Amino acid sequence: TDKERFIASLMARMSNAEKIGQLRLVSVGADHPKEALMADIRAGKVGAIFNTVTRPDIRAMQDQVRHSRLKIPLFHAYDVAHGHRTIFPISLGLAASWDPEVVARSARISALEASADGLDMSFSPMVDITRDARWGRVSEGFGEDTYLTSLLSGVMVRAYQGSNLAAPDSIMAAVKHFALYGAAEGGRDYNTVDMSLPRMFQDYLPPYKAAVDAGAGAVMVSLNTINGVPATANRWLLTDLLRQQWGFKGLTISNHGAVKELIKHGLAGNERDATRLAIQAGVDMNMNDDLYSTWLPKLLAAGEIDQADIDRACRDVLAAKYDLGLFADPYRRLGKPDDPPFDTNAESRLHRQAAREVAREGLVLLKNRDGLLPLKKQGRIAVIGPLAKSQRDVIGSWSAAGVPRQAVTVYQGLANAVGERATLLYAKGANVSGDQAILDYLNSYNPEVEVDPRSAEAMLEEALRTARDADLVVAVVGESQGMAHEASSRTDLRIPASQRRLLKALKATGKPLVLVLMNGRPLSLGWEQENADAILETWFSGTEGGNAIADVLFGEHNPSGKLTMSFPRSVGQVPVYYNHLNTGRPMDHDNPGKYTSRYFDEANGPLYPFGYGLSYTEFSLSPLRLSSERLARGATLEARVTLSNSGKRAGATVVQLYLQDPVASLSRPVKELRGFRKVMLEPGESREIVFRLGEADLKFYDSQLRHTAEPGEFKVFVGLDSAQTESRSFTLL
Amino acid sequence: TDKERFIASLMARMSNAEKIGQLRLVSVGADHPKEALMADIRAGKVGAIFNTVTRPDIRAMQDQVRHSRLKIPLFHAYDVAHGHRTIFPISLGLAASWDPEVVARSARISALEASADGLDMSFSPMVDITRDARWGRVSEGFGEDTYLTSLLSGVMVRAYQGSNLAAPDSIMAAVKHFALYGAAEGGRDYNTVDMSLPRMFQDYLPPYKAAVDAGAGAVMVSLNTINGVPATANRWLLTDLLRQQWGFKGLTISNHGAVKELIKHGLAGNERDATRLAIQAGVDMNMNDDLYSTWLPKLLAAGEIDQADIDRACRDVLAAKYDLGLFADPYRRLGKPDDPPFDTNAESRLHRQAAREVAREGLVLLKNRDGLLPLKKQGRIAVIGPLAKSQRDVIGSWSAAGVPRQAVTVYQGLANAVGERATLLYAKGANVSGDQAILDYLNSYNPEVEVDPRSAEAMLEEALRTARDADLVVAVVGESQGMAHEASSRTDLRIPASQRRLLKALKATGKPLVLVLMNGRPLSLGWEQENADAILETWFSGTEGGNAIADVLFGEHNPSGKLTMSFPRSVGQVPVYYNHLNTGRPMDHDNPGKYTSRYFDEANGPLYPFGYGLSYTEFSLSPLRLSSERLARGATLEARVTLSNSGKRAGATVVQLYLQDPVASLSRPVKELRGFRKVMLEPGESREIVFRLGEADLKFYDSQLRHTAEPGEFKVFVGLDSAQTESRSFTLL
């Protein structure tokens, strides 16, 4: 190609110093002061920047390139996870939309806004499967299902990169965290991951492959061990699998200080040996620790690495810059030199309509006793709890360049909706935690949690006076965003105790109690499901969160969100997930005995299963019908069902298709998602839903990692959640 | 060999019906009524019996063999886990002795008593590694450490089997549960086990190999999947590994209904296919479901199995009976035909001296503020709690033929110890649980828990009056044995709530509070460690438990037990174990960062670490000294330390040696136990302790299961627990 000629001609000009400079990815910080970094760019010693995110600041770096010998342009990256300046819901909330077009819209707008500020790359999407609700990074993924997360992984990559990676409104996707990062033992961040190869191939690796097959330009390597070998030093993972088996042609990027962390993992006794392990494993670009620039020349001179190791790494960096259009115009995302200056954070540069529409789709109605919701815009509404007026929490963790002061709180959304037609009464009620050690943690590094200095009792008495003066209570409760972030693993999945004390006292007033939950992970909600009159899961809903939440609470939008991760009854049940194996002694409704796979001291199964979520209307499914009883190899089967809105309000629901392979050479899950359809219906409307199934839906990795579909029975389940289904069978020939 | 000749000549005479009959293992019960079973034994349709446990009942079954054509004798098995009639501590408490001779004595007496009743075989030892405290079967193992569990696995097998399996006081060991059963996901019994091969080989499989290499005659196959394949159908596990790699020449026995359970696992669609999978995998003997007798003839005639499958399985049964001496004399464990009858449960047939001496060694002193223990035999002692007068709970789960009415309760042990020197005041204080659903579960089959009909409040007021009338309170609290048994997985590791309400009320009296804990698993003891004045862990200490516990509490025995399983701070930390990996971002207890592998909402690390346990005396260790800084291949290294009793009472402690391999081609544990010495010292005595290390101590399984020692640094740690050590390094050349 012209591309491989261009790259080979450029690399034939480069010294090893220049090639190694391309591998260096750095941020402005205590480790890399701005002026020292600018001098290094002028010297050709920097390949890319992260965490510089405004047009003037990015232009100033790109300007320094003109002073180097070869003038190779930088690329600029950032953590655009669920929004750049207009923040969408957290990924776990986006997944609850069950709508690839909603997810695509969030990614497209994110890319538009990030590229509008001069960024070329996001460290996104995060596509790690999560089965352990304790892990603080569950908020960054799409939940527990391999099918859904694989589909959304490909959608996010395509939406970011567009039809052309050189387009000024495109960014390159660096899919993360390769691999298995969300299986951390104990749900402790960065911890050991240990799993069988069949589980790895069938359940955990497919989302990364979906990103590679969608054309992701980059892969960000994870921080964890995989079966004893840190990903950063894992040649099987980064070379044999990612390059040789999957055919990935793009850029591998280390995580932050990950090469140096090989010493703490016990793979290397010094930085020189760590550098050798990372580059030979297949890590191209070294984030922040500068080990590559410090040690690659010495390693090469000693014969401890090959010239081909440097050349591979450099070619991948240059090829990413080529695809981004940066050799054609290094300023293609930076406008013209005499464009007038502007306010990066101007209102007119936000996308509030997209954020509000997307955030409505993710909200999950978990409980609604006797039609309490939707509320009428009238009377006296008490708005109570530490998350009601929180701008910092509504934008979530990994909020990129989001500005808390631009965010709509739940309180403000309700004020906007009711204008002068209803009276809102506010009381904080409790601090986010009553445990001072937890507040100390959450205010470590940055003051992110406002602490009311009053006693817990004084806050409670104020909230009880407010509730007593109202017709009903909207309690806005749950986690602060720093409880569901990197390194914030939890041993308790309940609402914090200070807030549960508040909820118990509010319940005792007899006022109708509506819970508006914010949180970044599944929560244990047994008391709430028994006592609250209605419960709306809002995740962290973003810059327009409070307006989208008010839209649902007042019935402008009929809640349509459904869970993509199972909600355990308690932390002592972890893990719970819907695509588990039967065991020899299943406990389910049809197997209720003592000598089954169960706990004895708590009810069994999730409180809310995968695919659960209610509506202000009711839906009906006709009987499931398959197009035949037998499926030949090479053929497709259809599964048909009619969905009807049998209630009085328009709304959407999600029709889910699951497969079981009840007899196989491995024990296969009791159900596995293999299709879904989100459908919006007016009252009395029907839609015929046709699912297609072929052999590709039926295959699995056996003990020898053969990817096989075995002849025999398959069971096809359809329903509006993973627990409320019916089945029909066919036979594969 | 005489055995091979004898078996070949017998099998050459046998029909396939006779060979298949040898594979059938059954119990008298609903499924096999006694008289029908006796007719089947006469017809040569039965190979062995389990759960028939008295000499007259066993002799009656062996008498039926005379009616079969070849008169092949039965063998008789039972679950003699930690005692037959004289019950020793549960295994987790036996392990806490750190004394292979104490563990061997428990096994030898168990074998003496079981063989005295006519039994030939125990389904024991249980050698599954346990890192998940929720699992109800942790009580049956030896804790979390591979070295210690492997050592005790071999000790148990040799103690059962003696110098000759034909000796009338020997029984055959059927080591269980092969394999990985204790790694059940979620700690739910029977659940999925999924792990890497390096973890399997390094940490989980060595105890089963130790039993094989100690000459175990039988292996009981587990109920769980291993990486998707049920053990019962796992040809890799039962044939490639157990026979071809490890050289096992004995008998494999299915678990209870395990062949039929291949249908529920989704490996088979019918009983015929389940039978085929089990026999071809390598399961010789079919427990209770009778699938082998029903289907093997049809499978053979269809060519779906080979004659060699039946012949392998039959040869292994005959070989077990040969080694048990049953072809030389089928009545060798059943006395003479005219022996007088006797009372099986006579006091004169118990071994109370041995039970008391053994039970003393496993008790673990967890806390002792200001030398409250040992108690003087004087004053007024309140004995309070639901476990104080419990005979059924002190003998534990898997109590075999133990008779609760023969057991010494904690109350009775204290009464025996003090005679008239002190006054005991009793109050039950609380029921074992306040939750009627849990009490109904525990009493669902048999009355196992006495439910005091009084209200919780009346029991508490009685206990508070009792405490006020006393000088100090001994609170006997924890789990009932049915909480730590097969299928009894727990979501909460605390003392039950009814009992914690009692403890808090007792604390508020200001009386000194001694907790005597009974339990079959690690418990979460944060409140207790803060508030109790002293804490003694007694596990379930067996038929003489109450006397052994009083021995420690009054200082006749200086506590010397040490934990063999880490005690988590809460269930939300599971798993916690001492031989974990460092990660790239380890948390430092002395300078603890946010961006480390940790929880934010609880203190980190176990409450009590592996190897922890206090004494009534003080011990000192001199500096660790290694015999050299460099170790040549094939040479031995010595690690020396002097232990001194620097206190005022005689006592024992356990000096533990740990190794770390800080740079390796896999991430290795922060430490691994590689030796120990239990040492009893009078005051002022000193012992030079010499550990020997060579290459075998330094090897590990790499990613490709190469089992070698890599040259480089090793760190040697010695101390009296896993957390408080001193360290020196050497280099392997």
Ligand SMILES: OC[C@H]1O[C@@H](O[C@H]2[C@H](O)[C@@H](O)[C@H](O)O[C@@H]2CO)[C@H](O)[C@@H](O)[C@H]1O
């Ligand atoms: O630890 C906070 C610190 O993390 C750095 O590295 C991030 C990386 O940017 C991101 O893509 C990945 O998902 O997580 C890494 C942390 O595990 C960030 O670059 C830096 O800005 C901080 O956010």
Ligand SMILES: OC[C@H]1O[C@@H](O[C@H]2[C@H](O)[C@@H](O)[C@H](O)O[C@@H]2CO)[C@H](O)[C@@H](O)[C@H]1O
């Ligand atoms: O389920 C209670 C039932 O278990 C049967 O099988 C036991 C087996 O005897 C024992 O060795 C093993 O460790 O556990 C199995 C259950 O998982 C017993 O045979 C029967 O007596 C009951 O105890």
Ligand SMILES: [Mg+2]
């Ligand atoms: Mg099948």
Ligand SMILES: [Mg+2]
């Ligand atoms: Mg080493």
